[PDB]
């Protein structure tokens, strides 16, 4: 028996990032946590751009991804973005935990299109680790550009991972698991190592015992 849950607090902290530079953009989702935005590493396929963060509070525009300070999660398609101090921070109400096998998750998505936003909760699905643990597999159909959307456990309502990649036939879907002591990484600066100008210049990346493409 698991407690019935309202997923609206998690929806209120989902943000839509769009890194645009010279007519080419990369749009995927993220999560708002204080002065930080947790999102996928493959958001930075291009360097020197303009980040557009769309939150429930407002829409923000940021100077140059090269100057941006980012903490990279080791061996995972995850990155912590340090927003400049002028941007208002979000709630620290989001709860991150390492996923547990045989624990069901639901993809929580916010629909920015409709005049009234919809806190969408997908159908439940089990999770299993893939190869070295860089990727975790779920059975929730995800459209393109839906990476960074939170995988939320139905037991305790914690974000256990963010969506990342899928196969070309769109039959298996892989998300990036939240690492151990990830909440310790958010509230303790001594564990954070910030880097600037990180970008993914390569077309093909070899991650998680797989060959992942950008398109």
């Amino acid at each position: 028996s698991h407690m019935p849950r309202d997923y609206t607090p998690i929806c209120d902290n989902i943000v839509k990032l769009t890194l645009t530079s010279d007519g080419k953009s990369i749009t995927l989702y993220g999560l708002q946590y204080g002065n930080y935005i947790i999102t996928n590493r493959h958001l930075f396929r291009l360097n020197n751009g303009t980040l557009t963060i769309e939150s429930k509070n407002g829409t923000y525009t940021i100077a140059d991804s090269k100057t941006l300070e980012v903490h990279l999660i080791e061996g995972k398609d995850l990155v912590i973005l340090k927003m400049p101090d002028s941007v208002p921070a979000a709630d620290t109400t989001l709860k991150f935990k390492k996923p547990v096998e045989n624990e069901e998750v639901v993809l929580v998505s916010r629909d920015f299109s409709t005049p009234e936003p919809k806190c969408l909760v997908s159908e439940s699905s089990k999770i299993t680790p893939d190869n070295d643990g860089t990727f975790w597999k779920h059975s929730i159909p995800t459209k393109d550009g839906e990476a960074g959307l939170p995988l939320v456990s139905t037991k305790d309502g914690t974000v256990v991972g963010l969506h990342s990649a899928s196969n070309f036939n769109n039959t298996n879907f892989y998300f990036t698991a939240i690492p151990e002591n990830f909440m310790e990484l958010l509230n303790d600066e001594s564990k954070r190592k910030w880097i600037k100008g990180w970008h993914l210049t390569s077309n093909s990346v070899e991650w998680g015992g797989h060959k992942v493409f950008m398109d």
């Binding site: 995927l28 996928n40 493959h42 398609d77 190869n131 990727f135 995800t142 459209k143 393109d144 550009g145 839906e146 990476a147 969506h163 990342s164 990649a165 899928s166 196969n167 070309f168 298996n172 892989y174 015992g209 797989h210 060959k211 992942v212 493409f213 950008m214 398109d215």
Partner: peptide, 7 residues
């Protein structure tokens, strides 16, 4: 194993 593409 199987090839993937980012989303």
């Amino acid at each position: 194993t199987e090839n993937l593409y980012f989303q």
